[PDB]
A paper describes a structure:
CIII2 transfers electrons from ubiquinol to cytochrome c (cyt c) and contributes to the proton gradient for ATP synthesis. In addition to the apo form, we resolved four distinct Q-bound states. In state I, the Q10 headgroup is situated near the [2Fe–2S] cluster at a distance of 10.8 Å, with the Rieske domain exclusively adopting the b position. Focused 3D classification uncovered a less-populated (approximately 13%) Q-binding state at the Qo site with its headgroup shifted around 6 Å closer towards the ISP compared with the dominant form. We propose that this state, rather than the dominant class, represents a transient electron-hopping phase from QH2 to [2Fe–2S] in ISP. Our results indicate a possible sequential progression from state I to state IV, characterized by increasing [2Fe–2S]–Q10 distances and decreasing [2Fe–2S]–haem c1 distances.
A key group of these are the respiratory chain supercomplexes (SCs); these which primarily consist of complexes I, III2 and IV (CI, CIII2 and CIV) in varying stoichiometries, which serve as the minimal functional units for NADH:O2 oxidoreduction. Here we report in situ structures of porcine respiratory SCs, determined directly through imaging porcine mitochondria by single-particle analysis combined with cryo-electron tomography (cryo-ET). Our in situ structures also capture numerous reactive intermediates within these respiratory supercomplexes, shedding light on the dynamic processes of the ubiquinone/ubiquinol exchange mechanism in complex I and the Q-cycle in complex III.
Author numbering:
A (entry chain 3A): 2 to 222, 228 to 446
B (entry chain 3B): 21 to 438
C (entry chain 3P): 326 to 379
D (entry chain 3E): 79 to 110
E (entry chain 3S): 12 to 109
F (entry chain 3C), I (entry chain 3P): 1 to 55
G (entry chain 3I): 32 to 78
H (entry chain 3Y): 2 to 52
């Protein structure tokens, strides 16, 4: 088993398609557990200004009682057989997955059929949930990471649905009524926009039979989004009482398509990640992280690759004190243009290995495998096998990384979002000047 | 294909390997050198040893270790509990040999150079501050201090009076007395036994004996209460349940899942959890109650953990406790027992499915039990538990010395005698 | 100190006119002035380091 | 909340090319 | 024998006349401060006092009495083991760089 | 590693002088004359030298 | 860790507030604390 | 010094040769333009009429 | 509230450049030449000006 043989030995993801348009897919294994869930193409990207937050609201209400299962009775099932019911709604995806035993798949799918089709939307339950969402919004206000990322989205995609947050404004939260929720679920939770993923010890034919027996009476056989526009801007929520200063700087990246994602991830793998409670410290190959550990510039930093259907954000997010924002902006831009102008071969090899490890280790356990299945059948349109990922990483070299970074980084207007004691944060002109090198 | 092959080495080592043909392979050296073995003059040494990975070893320098580990893009993570540390390395199955060599250098021939340890000692404060941002860390540390007298009372983190005074000689003595060839388990997922045996014969030759034996962790029953001022009062009241891997341990786990241990449906209502229903009929404010079960080698601790508002905390402590008393006299529906058994069997299987979880489970099995039992055996053992045992369980918890730890605005929290 | 003496020698030679007694002395002085700085001093430093066990 | 804030409209300052929300700006980035 | 020449050069250097030792006179290049920092406490204190005394003597243009001179056989290379490690680490970093 | 602009003492003085000096955003055009004076001075000096070379 | 865990370590920084019953679900420790800090991985705690 | 050279430095040199050569061309053109270097300026077509 | 010598900007520069500058205790007479050149420079300027007024 020389790695490549191990990659070939990974079982494939069989994909089917119901008459209603449900893309039933499954990956068979030998584990005695399973994770089955539907991924829907709803989210804030498909939400208008007045509807903003309806997806989060309906996701909240989904588990709190159905039509056939009144209230906690549904929950009474999930705990009775040891299942873990969970959900998450991204800006472009929504999902409700139920961890269960391999022998509980016939029931679990049934529960899923109840959650997405025969929902309740009880008015009194809506009233109880409204204040809960308000308090959750207040809790997220203290989340200086999520707040900064929402600031980045708003200041990068201003004037487009992508700028909208997942939870939506509090005004919409209090305004939203049952009619809007049922209209939203009837318009977005359509069969062609749903994929019933199931990883673990589930046989694909059994999954197909269950889906045909439960998800049959869905929609027959329309929000298709609008191409959003990137607008290099900046938001400075100067608040000196905050202890640290979260900064996020991004550029218009690629989408789920546009294979340039694979080299680009490698570049991010070169920059890497670091925080105070790390290991080697002033020895890690990342020059950014090594310098940060040497001079203690920050408490954290990361490189994200948020990519949507047609566009996406590529950049970094660092958490540091008030007296070191300028230095880390300098070093981060220096690393970006070092990769842009002369990426070398050894760093590219290290990035390839890091990306290989990320993809391989991320896809362990039934939950990440099922999530990958559901997300890939929506974004890529196909569950990309790990062998294809290996080949695509292998094709990446120094010249490819330099070219792709030049395409996406060099002389590009970034979007900046700072929160906290960000007085040191250089003005947007200085950042944009850092986005190009005079020597080169 | 393949099975978790088990072979105990003559030295005392136990090597178990499972070749699952996964693209990535992990190796965990599990050492029975947790924080329970720290004496009173060396507290916090285990913590620094946990952060002592990647320091310059005998065969590989710190720069070489970091560059080799991360150029492959591998892992070097130390997971320490109150009884057993575990070094873990993860990379592709193609580059496993270098990772194994680095792991064995960092676990078998460490140097603990004076300057390296002096520089590293600052990281203890950062680790403690980051971990203690979660109030549960403070609450659990206080609980362990106020429940066990000598052995398990030692914190997982270096006390503030020892930060900066952890001499390298202390680390060397700790390694020489606890990193013994008869107290460790080299567990490999994604590798083959002959390869793991060659690395076992590679260095893996410390004193080979059983090291410095610990002391039986006597029970205290004390009460540690700190007033940190954050609104959410966390309280935890426990009693000595039983040692791990015993019939009483299984009964106590079943009782934990009867009472309720964490949520299952995200943002649900914990309807099955009897404690949540009992408390909710009282306080109508944001709270969270859950059975807290700890099962160590020598003894254990079963109790209730309640996060509650400052004013309501006492009620949350009272009614929930009364709920347990309701089981003590006997109110356990056999349906509830069956549901809890199903929840336990699930939770176990869904904890084993993950590669990391599988590795930790096999490491703990090798260290404590000395052998490995298939999941079917554990499920059968859980099924063998009867209702009368769960009723022991409740009687033992109710009638015993209760150790309590609290944190928050403790203006109304009841004391142990209340 | 040989370098310093060479500097005074160069000064005196520059003072004097350019005839047979002085031309050769000037050539040797210039060669020595460059040689001490570029060759003799570093090699001598190597010799001293070796002689002092480092 | 952080979600309540929204970027004010700049439509009277923006260049003609980057003025439509339903059109990417990468194409006109080179021209600008 | 070569040791005679080494003794002659040691006596001619004259840093022993100030009470200094070999490693007390090494030029502090970038490796040298790192090597010094790693020195144990007692060696560092002795080194700093010896250098302070040497500076005191040179300010008055005086030397130690003949009795208190560091003899060539008593001279210790306290810094040498640390300097070798620092240089080796720098060489390893350079080799990984290329 | 340190930024040469903020670490080199000469470049440090230049940086604190007119590179990263915090200046008010609303200073009118009337402040520009300050720089003009210096500019004029420099120009004057140059011309002065080229006048002192034939006078 | 190719992956930078999930939540990083912002020392000298406030934790995520609370104040909702649903958000406070199952925060009550049920298993003994274990800590995991290592080379090229953010530190984590699990109970 | 010999501490340089090796694998990593040669592709750095290769990557920066195009930019360095373009900067050298910039310097050459700026020099010939600044001093009005005749020798070159009796060859470029339209500027021949300057002299 | 504070000594002018190390609070006034020009006085601070003069203080930490000529008054409170930490210098080695055993610098020989040769180091003195560093001052002399500077003094010579002034002596060259101050005298030289007085020649320029009749040359
Ligand atoms: C000429 C073309 C450029 C060239 O040949 O070398 C560019 C090169 C700078 O390359 P770079 O990629 O912009 O450097 C980025 C670094 O991060 C270094 O810059 P930074 O990130 O620390 O700060 C960003 C920015 C900060 O802005 C400045 O430093 C202001 C520059 C002067 C502006 C005029 C007013 C102040 C005087 O830096 C500069 O603008 C570079 C200043 C030095 C070059 C220009 C000198 C002009 C003198 C008149 O110039 C030098 O290294 C200086 C010597 C050669 C140029 C002058 C002759
Ligand atoms: C049409 C008939 C009326 C023309 C304007 C008359 C007048 O008094 O305008 C004042 C008016 C400014 O009045 P303000 O707001 O009370 O003073 C603002 C400051 O002058 C600062 O304003 P700024 O930052 O726009 O700079 C303006 C400055 C620009 O010029 C200078 O700074 C240098 C002035 C001396 C040369 O010139 C002046 O302030 C003096 C007036 C120049 C002639 C008009 O001048 C302008 O807005 C500039 C007009 C430029 C020509 C078009
Ligand atoms: C009696 C036989 C002759 C003895 C002097 C000749 C000789 O080679 O002595 C070497 C003998 C051994 O040299 P050293 O003291 O180990 O090294 C010179 C000191 O580091 C640096 O020199 P120092 O600070 O130990 O002594 C300063 C010395 C010499 O001061 C200087 O050499 C620098 C200023 C004067 C330059 C030459 C002007 C003629 O002052 C004088 O010789 C008398 C006043 C001269 C003007 C003010 C100074 O030094 C002396 O006898 C006194 C210094 C050299 C005098 C010439
Ligand atoms: C006179 C020319 C300099 C003054 C006007 C231009 C200026 O102040 O800045 C623009 C220019 C380019 O460099 P800049 O983008 O400021 O910073 C380096 C890249 N991060 O800065 C310059 O210094 C440009 C001229 C030298 C190259
Ligand atoms: C006068 C005011 C302007 C000049 C001083 C302030 C600007 C910084 C110094 C000059 C400069 O542009 O230096 C560029 C570069 C700096 O080094 P670099 O590794 O690019 O960046 C990290 C360290 N600053 O240093 C270099 O030598 C770059 C290479 C040569 C130029 C091409
Ligand atoms: C110092 C730079 C020169 C300063 C004085 C300017 C005049 C000069 O010395 O050379 C000017 C010369 C103009 O062109 P020129 O070389 O005279 O063309 C006919 C050749 N037979 O142009 C040059 O000499 C340009 C090249 C100058 C640098 C040397 C190569
Ligand atoms: C502070 C800046 C200066 C000012 C305001 C200034 C002013 C003047 C003025 C008003 C004149 C008379 C011009 C005329 O009548 O035609 C003059 C002449 C002259 N200045 Fe300056 N000057 C300055 C700097 C200098 C410097 C630095 C030098 C020497 C390098 C210099 C050398 C001369 C000479 C040689 C003349 C005589 C030539 C002439 O009068 O046209 N000046 N200057
Ligand atoms: C760097 C320092 C200086 C040096 C080394 C220097 C050197 C000289 C020398 C060697 C002479 C020839 C003297 C003679 O042959 O009689 C001279 C003359 C002169 N220097 Fe300077 N000088 C300096 C500074 C200055 C300054 C600052 C000025 C202007 C203020 C100046 C103005 C003159 C003048 C006007 C003369 C001619 C007077 C005469 O005939 O001696 N010098 N200088």
């Amino acid at each position: 088993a020389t790695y490549a043989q191990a990659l070939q030995s990974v079982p494939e993801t069989q994909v089917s398609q119901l008459d209603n348009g449900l893309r039933v897919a499954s990956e068979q294994s030998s584990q005695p557990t399973c994770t089955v869930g539907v991924w829907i193409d709803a989210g804030s990207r498909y939400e208008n200004e007045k509807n903003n937050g309806a997806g989060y609201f309906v996701e909240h209400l989904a588990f709190k009682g159905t039509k056939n299962r009144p209230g906690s009775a549904l929950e009474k099932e999930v705990e009775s057989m040891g299942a873990h019911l969970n959900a998450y709604s991204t800006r472009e995806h929504t999902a409700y997955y139920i961890k269960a035993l391999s022998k509980d798949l016939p029931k679990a799918v049934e529960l899923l059929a109840d959650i997405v089709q025969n929902c309740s939307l009880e008015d009194s339950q809506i009233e109880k949930e409204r204040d809960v969402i308000l308090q959750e919004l207040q809790e997220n206000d203290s989340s200086m990471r999520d707040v900064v990322f929402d600031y980045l989205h708003a200041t990068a995609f201003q004037g487009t649905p992508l700028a909208q947050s997942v939870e939506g404004p509090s005004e919409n939260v209090r305004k939203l009524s049952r009619a809007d929720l049922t209209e939203y679920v009837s318009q977005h939770y359509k069969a062609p926009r749903m994929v019933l993923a199931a990883a673990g010890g589930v046989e694909h034919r059994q999954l197909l039979d269950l889906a045909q027996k439960h998800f049959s009476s869905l929609s027959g056989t329309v929000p298709a989004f609008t191409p959003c526009r990137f607008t290099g801007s900046e938001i400075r929520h100067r608040d000196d009482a905050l202890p640290l200063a979260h900064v996020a700087i991004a550029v218009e990246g690629p989408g789920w398509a546009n294979p340039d994602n694979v080299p680009l991830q490698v570049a991010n793998a070169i920059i890497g990640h670091y925080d105070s409670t790390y290991g080697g410290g002033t020895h890690m190959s990342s020059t950014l992280a090594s310098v940060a550990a040497t001079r203690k510039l920050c408490q954290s930093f990361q490189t994200f690759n948020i990519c949507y259907a047609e566009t996406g954000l590529l950049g970094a997010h660092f958490v540091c004190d008030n007296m070191s924002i300028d230095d880390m902006m300098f070093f981060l831009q220096g690393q970006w243009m070092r990769l842009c102008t002369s990426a070398t071969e050894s760093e590219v090899v290290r990035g390839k290995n890091i990306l290989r490890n990320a993809l391989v280790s991320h896809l362990d356990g039934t939950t990440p495998v099922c999530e990958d299945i559901g997300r890939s059948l929506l974004t890529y349109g196909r569950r990309i096998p790990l062998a294809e990922w290996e080949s695509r990483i292998a094709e990446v070299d120094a010249s490819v990384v330099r070219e792709v970074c030049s395409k996406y980084f060099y002389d590009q207007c970034p979007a900046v979002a700072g929160l906290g004691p960000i007085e040191q944060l250089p003005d947007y002109n200085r950042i944009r000047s850092g986005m190009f090198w005079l020597r080169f | 294909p393949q099975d978790l092959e088990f072979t105990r080495l003559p030295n005392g080592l136990v090597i178990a390997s499972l070749e699952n043909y996964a693209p990535a392979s992990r190796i965990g050296l599990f050492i029975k050198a947790g924080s329970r073995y720290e004496d009173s003059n060396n507290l916090g040494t285990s913590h620094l040893l946990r952060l002592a990975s990647s320091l310059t070893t005998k065969g590989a320098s710190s720069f070489k270790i970091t560059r080799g580990i991360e150029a492959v893009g591998g892992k070097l993570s130390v997971t320490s509990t109150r009884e057993s540390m575990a070094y873990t390395v993860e990379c592709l199955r193609d580059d496993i040999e270098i990772l194994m060599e680095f792991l064995l250098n960092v676990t078998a021939a460490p140097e603990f150079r004076r300057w390296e340890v002096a520089a590293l000692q600052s990281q203890l404060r950062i680790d403690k501050a980051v971990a203690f941002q979660n109030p549960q860390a403070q609450v659990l540390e206080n609980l362990h201090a106020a429940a066990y007298r000598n052995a398990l009372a030692n914190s997982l983190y270096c006390p503030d009076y020892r930060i900066g005074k952890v001499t390298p000689d202390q680390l060397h003595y700790y390694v020489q007395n606890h990193f013994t060839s008869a107290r460790m388990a080299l567990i490999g997922l994604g590798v083959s036994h002959p390869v793991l045996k060659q690395v076992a014969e590679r260095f893996l030759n410390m004193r080979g004996g059983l090291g410095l034996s610990g002391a039986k962790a006597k029970y205290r029953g004390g009460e540690i209460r700190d007033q940190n001022g954050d609104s959410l009062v966390h309280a935890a009241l426990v009693a000595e349940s039983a040692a791990t891997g015993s019939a009483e341990a299984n009964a106590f786990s079943v009782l934990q899942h009867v009472l309720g241990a964490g949520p299952h449906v995200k943002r649900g209502s914990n309807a099955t959890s009897s404690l949540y229903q009992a408390v909710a009929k009282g306080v109508h404010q944001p709270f969270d109650v859950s059975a807290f079960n700890a099962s160590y080698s020598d003894s254990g601790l079963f109790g209730i953990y309640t996060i509650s508002q400052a004013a309501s905390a006492g009620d949350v402590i009272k009614s929930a406790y009364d709920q347990v008393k309701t089981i003590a006299q006997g109110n356990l529906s056999n349906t509830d027992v069956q549901a809890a058994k199903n929840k336990l069997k699930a939770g176990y299987l869904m904890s084993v499915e993950s590669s990391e979880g599988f590795l930790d489970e096999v490491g703990s099995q090798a260290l404590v039990a000395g052998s490995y039992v298939q999941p079917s055996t554990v499920l059968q053992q859980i099924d063998s538990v009867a209702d009368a045992d769960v009723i022991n369980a409740a009687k033992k918890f109710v009638s015993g010395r209760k150790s309590m730890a609290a944190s928050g605005n403790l203006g109304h929290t009841p004391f142990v005698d209340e | 100190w040989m370098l310093v003496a060479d500097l005074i020698t160069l000064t005196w030679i520059g003072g004097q006119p350019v005839e047979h007694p002085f031309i050769i002395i000037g050539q040797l002085a210039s060669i020595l002035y460059f040689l001490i700085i570029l060759v003799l001093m570093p090699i001598t430093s190597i010799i001293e380091n070796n002689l002092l066990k480092w | 909340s952080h979600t309540d804030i929204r970027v004010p409209d700049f439509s009277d300052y923006r260049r003609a090319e980057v003025l439509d929300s339903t059109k990417s700006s990468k194409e006109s980035s080179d021209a600008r | 024998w070569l040791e005679g020449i080494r003794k002659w050069y040691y006596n001619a250097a004259g840093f022993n006349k100030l009470g200094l030792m070999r490693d007390d006179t090494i030029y502090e290049d970038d490796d040298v401060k790192e090597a010094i920092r790693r020195l144990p406490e007692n060696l560092y204190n002795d080194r700093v006092f010896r250098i302070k005394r040497a500076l005191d003597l040179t300010m008055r243009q005086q030397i130690l009495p003949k009795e208190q001179w560091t003899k060539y056989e008593e001279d210790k290379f306290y810094l040498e083991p640390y300097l070798k490690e620092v240089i080796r680490e720098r060489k390893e970093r350079e080799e990984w760089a290329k | 590693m340190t930024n040469i602009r903020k670490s080199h003492p000469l470049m440090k003085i230049i940086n604190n002088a007119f590179i990263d000096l915090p200046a008010p955003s609303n200073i009118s055009s009337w402040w520009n004359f300050g720089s003009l004076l210096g500019i004029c001075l420099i120009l004057q000096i140059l011309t002065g030298l080229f006048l002192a070379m034939h006078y | 860790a190719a992956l930078p865990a999930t939540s990083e370590s912002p020392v000298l920084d406030a934790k995520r507030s609370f104040l909702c019953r649903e958000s406070l679900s199952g925060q009550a420790a049920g298993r003994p604390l274990v800590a995991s800090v290592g080379l090229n991985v953010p530190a984590s705690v699990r109970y | 010094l010999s501490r340089f050279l090796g694998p990593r430095y040669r592709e750095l040199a290769r990557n920066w040769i195009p930019t360095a050569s373009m900067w050298g061309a910039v310097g050459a053109v700026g020099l010939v333009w600044a001093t009005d270097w005749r020798l070159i300026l009796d060859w470029v077509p339209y500027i021949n009429g300057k002299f």
